[PDB]
């Protein structure tokens, strides 16, 4: 900026256990004149891991 500011992050969609069960990704949507939704944003568990499509991944 200038070409966007104050991006938002809603509470997580589903719980870690609920994500691993339904095979979905642990993410929280983010937002950013016209308001824009940028997409579901993955989140890191307390164990320092991510749930990407129901599987527990770790970034090295």
């Amino acid at each position: 900026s200038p070409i966007f500011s104050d991006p938002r992050f809603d509470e997580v969609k589903a719980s870690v256990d609920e994500c691993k069960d339904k095979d979905m990704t642990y993410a929280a949507p983010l937002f950013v004149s016209q308001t824009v939704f940028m997409g579901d944003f993955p989140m890191m568990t307390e164990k320092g891991t991510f749930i990407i499509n129901g599987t527990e991944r770790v970034v090295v």
Binding site: P29, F31, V36, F37, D40
Partner: protein, 303 residues
């Protein structure tokens, strides 16, 4: 060194045209087509023309075609400037360009100098459409008619728009409502949109084996079955021996064991020279005889 570099070095040699030149070439082209058609029509209608004038019209064609070629070679830059935007969408840059030139050719054939509009105005439409229409006909390994490529892109557009409004991927119901079609249709559509994957890819670690290696050939013969099947044919042969000579043949023909093609009651009755009902009666008795424990117990294992 590089080919796309060469094509640009040649189109860049041609001199761009102003508004006045375009109309002159446009005129010469239309004069070339009518002159050529007039000479052909005069022979059909049994008419002649002044010698000197007739030879003048013939030259109008040579000058007309030079006008056509000259008009195209000047606006080749326009084709490229439009072809840059469609790269990386599954079509080589050159292929986009050549398809653009195809569209460009048509624009020249339909351009109208009397309207007074700059040529690039009307050529951009055809060149643009020529490229897009090409992608719908060639970009996909499994071709999809343009009307389906049309709706697929429309659905993705609604999806992307609905995605931006709701903040969540729209469900089939939401996506079907906004698109005024059945949710099952969007599903059927979403199956068509999927493109294939490369067998020559390497799913195994460090090129241990390509993906194609893991594909079963389910049609391949099964050794154990070809042997059991062979033993079944042999076992039925014996069972056929217990039946009547004619009765065994009826069973063969009815199921086509001998010639591999079954026969209707009439056809079977035609070879034995009796009614088609008589064959129906005979067959039923064969099955009863076949369901007898002595003859039938041996074949249960073959399921």
């Amino acid at each position: 060194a590089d080919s796309v570099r060469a094509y640009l070095k040649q189109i860049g040699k041609v001199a761009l045209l102003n508004a006045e030149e375009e109309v002159e070439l446009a005129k010469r082209i239309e004069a070339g087509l009518y002159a050529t058609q007039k000479l052909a029509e005069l022979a059909e209608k049994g008419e002649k023309l002044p010698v000197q004038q007739r030879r003048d019209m013939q030259w109008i064609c040579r000058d007309g075609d030079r006008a056509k070629n000259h008009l195209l070679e000047a606006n080749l830059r326009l084709v490229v400037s439009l072809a840059k935007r469609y790269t990386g969408r599954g079509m080589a840059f050159l292929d986009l360009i050549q398809e653009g030139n195809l569209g460009l050719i048509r624009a020249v054939e339909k351009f109208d100098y009397t309207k007074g509009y700059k040529f690039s105005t009307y050529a951009t439409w055809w060149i643009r459409q020529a490229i897009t229409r090409a992608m719908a006909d060639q970009a996909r390994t499994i071709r999809i008619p343009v009307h389906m490529v049309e709706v697929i892109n429309k659905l993705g557009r609604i999806q992307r728009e609905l995605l931006q409004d709701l903040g969540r991927e729209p469900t089939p119901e939401e996506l079907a409502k906004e698109m005024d079609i059945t949710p099952e249709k969007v599903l059927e559509i979403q199956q068509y949109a999927r493109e294939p994957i490369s067998l020559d890819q390497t799913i195994g670690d460090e090129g241990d084996s390509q993906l194609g290696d893991f594909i079963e050939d389910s049609e391949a013969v099964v050794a154990v079955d070809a042997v059991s099947f062979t033993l079944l044919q042999d076992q039925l042969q014996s069972v056929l021996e217990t039946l009547s000579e004619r009765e065994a043949g009826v069973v063969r023909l009815r199921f086509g064991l001998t010639d591999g093609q079954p026969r209707t009651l009439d056809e079977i009755g035609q070879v034995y020279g009796v009614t088609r009902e008589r064959i129906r009666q005979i067959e039923s008795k064969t099955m009863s005889k076949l369901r007898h424990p002595s003859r039938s117990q041996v074949l249960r294992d073959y399921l």
